[PDB]
Amino acid sequence: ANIVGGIEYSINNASLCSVGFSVTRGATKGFVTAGHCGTVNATARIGGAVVGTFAARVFPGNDRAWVSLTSAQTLLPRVANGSSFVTVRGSTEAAVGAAVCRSGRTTGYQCGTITAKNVTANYAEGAVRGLTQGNACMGRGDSGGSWITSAGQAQGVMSGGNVQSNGNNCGIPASQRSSLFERLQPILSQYGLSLVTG
Numbered sequence: 250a251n252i253v254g255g256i257e258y259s260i261n262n263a264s265l266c267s268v269g270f271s272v273t274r275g276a277t278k279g280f281v282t283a284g285h286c287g288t289v290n291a292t293a294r295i296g297g298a299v300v301g302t303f304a305a306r307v308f309p310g311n312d313r314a315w316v317s318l319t320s321a322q323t324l325l326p327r328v329a330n331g332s333s334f335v336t337v338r339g340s341t342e343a344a345v346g347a348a349v350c351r352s353g354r355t356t357g358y359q360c361g362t363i364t365a366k367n368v369t370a371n372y373a374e375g376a377v378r379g380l381t382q383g384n385a386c387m388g389r390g391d392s393g394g395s396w397i398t399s400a401g402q403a404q405g406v407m408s409g410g411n412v413q414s415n416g417n418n419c420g421i422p423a424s425q426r427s428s429l430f431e432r433l434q435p436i437l438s439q440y441g442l443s444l445v446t447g
Contacts, residue, residue, distance in 0.1 A: 250295040252280050252318065254328030254337070254395030254403075255352025259294045260287040260303075267353035267394030269406035270337060270433070271324035271445040278318040281436050282393030283406050284308030285374070287316075305440055309375035312408040313436045314393075326447035328395040328403075330358040336447045338401030340433055349383050349398055351407055351430070353391030355416070360399075361385030361423055370409050370429055380408055380429040387428045388417030396430045403444060405430035 252271045259265055266286035272279045284306035287293070291303045293316045300322050306314035318324075327334040329352050343349060343363055350360040361384040368380045383396070387410050396404040410428035411418050418426045437444065 250298065250300050251323045251325055253325055253334070254397070255354070255358065256295065256329055257354035258300070261291050262294070265354060265390050266392050267390065267407065269393050269395055270403050271326065272315065272437070272442040273324070273445065274440065274442050278320060278322050278324050279304065279315045279442065280318065281313070281315050281406055281433070281442065283408055283431065284312045284314040286393045287314060309372060309377050311379070312377045312431045313406065313439070315436070315440050315442060324445045326445045328352045328397050335397055335399065336401050337397065337403050337444060338446055339403070340437065340444050341402040342432065342434060343398055343402060343404060347398065349385065349396055349404055351385050351387060351391065351394060351396045351428070353387065353394030353407055355388040355390035356386060356419055359385040359387065361426070368429055372409060377408060379432065381405060381432055383428050383430065384423040384426045385428055386417060386419035386426055388412060388419065403433050405433045406436070
């Protein structure tokens, strides 16, 4: 499969999440995603086909993981924006107030601004600390997916947010949204990963 931020993948033939970003670990191909999407060794599929397995994750506390892919997968420095793409150009972290977008299999490509840093989410499984908050909308299944600026700076991976009874927070105003992502930089260093860029 072609590995593009925001696309769907399944975990053990069960849950669906979204790809974060193509990465390498030495010779090993991978993608980063959210930790709550799978346990170590869980099987990832795209397009009906096995593409790899969860190599490592931290969740709760953090919310991060990477999927170690077979060599047959095609890593790409891209995030889905409708039928188009946003090129991944680096991992510079944006400040509060910056515009940012996110991509995922439920709500597609959505944009807003960064409103706060170092936010704690109290999820079912436990607290997750250190999250960045934006007011782009999202919904269930967008977890793991890319957060990126239009200028191509990869920010992090979708963790959670204040989804409403319809499964998303797109039906409330931006001022009322809390959409939380796990910062990319600590994921990259904890697992020794390099971001695929173009």
